[PDB]
Symmetry: C3
Subunit: 350 residues, 3 copies
């Protein structure tokens, strides 16, 4: 009971205890804590679970993610960006995403040690871009989200491109052939297995076991996040079916990571939870899937993956709408927390 409360939420007691210890242990929390905040979680335990899932899939990707997030945190410190924001991990999840997605899309092969240096440089530059986006987005009271990650990875990726001698990348070509979609060949087992692999694809992992581990991590923190995550993956696969995407893309979960993230964000994290806000989250996740198709097709010309760009665009657009009803209530950015605490704050204010 008490222990379950302790391991839930943002882990506040652990937070004070870690305050006392040496700078080195702390940097570990701040990196474990920021590892799991891609999915809007401030739980170090869940972050360790996320890391375990990364190790399970591929050791090289996990090592790159770890080094990227640790160097993003170190860069946030050296720049004196903020304390209490770095300590909550707001500067590390961009770094881990940059490292992981640089390791995923690199054609140089596994254990290519020279990949660390661009990884280091991109991850260190993440706090700079995060502060730059925070300066712009603070006028409208909007969060940075995953935009630094997108900007930095897209740079490495286009800069170098597939035809590079030192840091080659994977081929991304625009579609130029009519993909006949034999509906009788659809497999329902993989179609429903697209739910865990879809949530696992947030970090580039396409292993159903890693997706299940990520779902376990989300459930440990807050069941509401888990529910919105699984419903986001479901609407992502449904939209992929509706837009005649190849069945392999749906099975791999390429249509689900933007939707799961967008449903987590709008439904419980930044909008106070309500049935109206729940349908807003579902509509936002559908629009995020459809815009994800659009973005993936647009970015294919340059030779780049869609990444988390659709999620940012949809989440910002929804987070910006103004309404004449009191049910859809945007929370002030200073008082945003895990969705249960946000609902508690909404109840206390009302």
């Amino acid at each position: 009971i008490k222990w379950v409360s302790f391991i839930s939420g943002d882990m506040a007691a652990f937070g004070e205890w870690m305050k006392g210890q040496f700078i080195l242990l702390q940097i570990m929390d701040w990196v474990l804590r920021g590892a799991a905040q891609v999915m809007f979680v401030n739980n170090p335990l869940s972050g360790l679970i996320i890391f375990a899932g990364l190790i399970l899939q591929n050791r090289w990707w996990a090592l790159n993610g770890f080094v990227g997030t640790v160097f993003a945190t170190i860069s946030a410190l050296i720049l004196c960006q903020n304390r209490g924001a770095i300590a909550a991990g707001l500067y590390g999840y961009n770094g881990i995403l940059v490292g992981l997605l640089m390791a995923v899309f690199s054609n140089a092969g596994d254990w290519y040690w020279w990949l660390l240096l661009p990884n280091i440089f991109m991850s260190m530059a993440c706090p700079i871009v995060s502060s730059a986006l925070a300066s712009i987005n603070s006028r409208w009271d909007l969060p940075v989200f995953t935009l630094p990650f997108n900007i930095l990875v897209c740079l490495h990726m286009v800069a170098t491109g597939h035809y590079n001698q030192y840091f080659p990348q994977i081929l991304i070509q625009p579609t130029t052939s009519m993909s006949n979609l034999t509906w009788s060949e659809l497999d329902y087992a993989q179609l429903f297995r697209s739910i865990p692999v879809g949530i696992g694809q947030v970090y580039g992992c396409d292993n159903a076991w890693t997706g299940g581990i990520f779902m376990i991590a989300l459930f440990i923190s807050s069941p509401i996040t888990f529910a919105h995550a699984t419903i986001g993956s479901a609407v992502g696969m449904v939209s992929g079916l509706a837009l005649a995407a190849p069945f392999k893309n749906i099975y791999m979960g390429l249509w689900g990571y933007n939707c799961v993230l967008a449903c987590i964000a709008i439904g419980g994290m930044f909008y106070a939870l309500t049935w109206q806000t729940h349908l807003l989250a579902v509509a936002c996740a559908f629009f995020c899937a459809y815009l994800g198709s659009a973005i993936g097709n647009v970015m294919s010309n340059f030779g780049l993956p869609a990444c988390t760009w659709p999620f940012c665009l949809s989440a910002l657009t929804f987070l910006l709408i103004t309404t004449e009803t009191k049910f859809i209530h945007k929370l002030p950015l200073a008082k945003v927390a895990y969705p249960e605490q946000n609902l508690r704050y909404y109840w206390k204010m009302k």
Copy 2:
């Protein structure tokens, strides 16, 4: 005399009378009224005339435009976006443009009933994007314009693309051949006929009779709008000649719809009318044509038409310039009306 005044302008008396009647009649005004406000008109009569022109050209396109605008209005209501703004049609013209331009560019053929569903979804999502753009553009006191339409249609279009099984689109390929322009083959009859078809191309109509019907609708509302519209089409065709565009493009009016809209906007709608503002409108329409060429070439790589994107970019840029003279006077967005009333307000203030 009195009747002519009644059918002119924004139609204010009709506006109060319609206030009383059932919600269903009202939704019809609000859709008729918003049909004609692509060209910045609040006249239901003109909207009916615009609809008649659409029916004249192609029944399928007109049906798609009608359903798109009605569902945009319904979505504005269900979201409680605003009343008095929905009642003026500020949320319907984006919907009708989305529906019409989805029907125009769809390669599935006429009377393809499955086209309604993406049409419904895009049109319903128009108020969301309109509010999102209004949140950003209200800081600088700028209007949303046709930006939601552009964003939503470009999404459907790229998402799906030509190589799609369910919702195929038309081919748009970048130019890769030297187009020899035999100046002796120019036809002056079609060159001057490019004026009505250019204004008709605002809705995707390339019929000279439909363009003339649209010009009649504009004249019914306000002669100043008609004058700026025809001069915008003229500068569009002149710029198309100056940039060595193929003569067929000029004849079809592909070079005129952005210019006519931009000249209508800057000259009388948002800047108080003056000879200085008139030359500003002409320069804005020339820049809009030249940027329209640029945008049409840029978007051709992705497989998308230029759409109304050039108009938005030019109009915003001009609406943002700051000046040290009192002749170019930007009106406050709350007190914008038909250009005659705007000039009356300018005279009353001065």
Copy 3:
């Protein structure tokens, strides 16, 4: 001594004296003064030196730059944009860049007299876009930089493209072949000669003598600008080596003009000079080189050069970061001057 002080800085005494003379002499200062403010200099003498360097390389390019900047100044006057800002040359450097880079990339051949007309139109439109960007960027207290130049040249360029009958352009194709980089074939003489040609490439000049002339002009104004300029070119060539760019590109200086400009801007012009700000300038120039590779690859699909786009993006991002230390101090835009005067102001305030 006194004369050296007179020819240094912003040339203030000359500034008052020129105030009295006829409008025609003045327009010459305001064009000479704005010619050299691409590199953030308000010295007419240096501007004449910049012009001499342009003449040295190619007469046609220099003539186009002169006419572009004079028409940008005339357009700033006719629009009543500002006095004291036009008199300082804030509206002319965009014009000279537009003219020079239109003359450089035009495939019609030297002394193609019809190139003046698009040159005139783009250069006259530069104050409009400059005011539009100033309206947006004044909220965050940020400068327009070279953005109007980029927007206007990219328009001419895409609009027309290589396959145009009247205004053909040069081929820019995306890389599709594996460039084997024989490290033994590197030449150190040209590798170090990439420093002056890199700074000369700011205006499109790829002559080492013209680069040296530009360096002399920078030294005349302020030695700090010269130091940051040469270190920016050095980091540009180093980054070009690190990203496996073809050695010819590094030798020509295609990797240095964005970095030299960004190091000049962040290090001394807009951030008060400090060792912390100096390392910030070096990091900004490295990020500017790497983003320059990214942008050059992205824009290659449309058929356009990278231009000064990377510089703008990097400079704005760095100029937007918020920090918790007092060493990195962003100056108010009203009180920005040559870096020596900025350091003097910083010392006086502190």
